[PDB]
Amino acid sequence: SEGVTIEFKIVGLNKKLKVFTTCPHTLFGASFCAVAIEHPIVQDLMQDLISSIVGIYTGLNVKHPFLDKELPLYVANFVLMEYREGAIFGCPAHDQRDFEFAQEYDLPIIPVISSARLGIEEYTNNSIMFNSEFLNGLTVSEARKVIVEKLEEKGIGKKTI
């Protein structure tokens, strides 16, 4: 559904990777990036392990837009190309798809969503973000609103439904 496209700088090549996500507030808990096999970046400047033969590390990282931190870029068979761009960032702590990836390839787990008691959680007092620098202390809905403004003001991302 409605989401946002984020432009990641790749340390390896001149082309920048553009991922689509429905949960931009979890960007600070990102452990890695990953693309499908049929992605332009794969065939452009990179194959024996990919074509013949879970995911494979490209050898290059991507610069995290809001942290002095690099994330490993992967090419996995589980990644779906059809849905939008076919490129995503993995949040192990709040996604079982991304966790099983991080568990196998020893990628770090960073939780960023402090969940509240269930009776009060979803009604109004949405879970509190943390480990997210400026997003700390505010709710998920407020985090998703603010983080999009940071992406748009700095030319990093734009709204896409």
Instruction: Identify the CATH number of the domain in which residue 68 sits.
Output: 3.90.740.10
Query: Strand 70-76 and strand 32-35: pairing?
Result: parallel
Closest among 68, 104, 66, 73 to 89, alpha carbons compared = 73
Query: Strand 32-35 and strand 87-90: pairing?
Result: antiparallel
**Kind and range of the H or E run holding 97:** helix 96-104
Q: CB neighbours of 76 closer than 8 A, spacing ≥ 6?
A: 34, 36, 54, 55, 56, 101
CA distance 137 to 135: 7
**Residue 105: inside a domain:** yes
Distances, alpha carbon 54 to alpha carbons 49, 57, 93, 131, in Å: 12, 10, 18, 28
Decide: 74 and 33 in contact? Cβ < 8 Å. yes
CA distance 34 to 85: 11
CA distance 19 to 88: 5
CA distance 73 to 32: 6
The domain total for the chain is 1
CA distance 85 to 64: 19
**Residue 66: inside a domain:** yes
**Residue 153: inside a domain:** no
**Residue 35: inside a domain:** yes
**Residue 150: inside a domain:** no
**Residue 89: inside a domain:** yes
Three-state SS at 26: helix
Burial code (b: 16+ CB inside 10 Å, e: under 16) for 56-79 equals: eebebbbebbbeeeebbbbbbeeb
Indicate which technique resolved this structure. Answer: X-ray
Decide: 6 and 18 in contact? Cβ < 8 Å. yes
CA distance 143 to 148: 9
Distances, alpha carbon 144 to alpha carbons 43, 79, 93, 109, 129, in Å: 33, 24, 17, 21, 10
Q: What is the domain range of residue 39?
A: 3-110
In angstroms, this model's resolution equals: 3.0
**Residue 145: inside a domain:** no
**Residue 133: inside a domain:** no
Tell how far CA 94 is from the center of its chain.
11
The amino acid that residue 57 corresponds to is Y
- 133, with CB counted inside 10 A (0-12, 13-18, 19+), is exposed
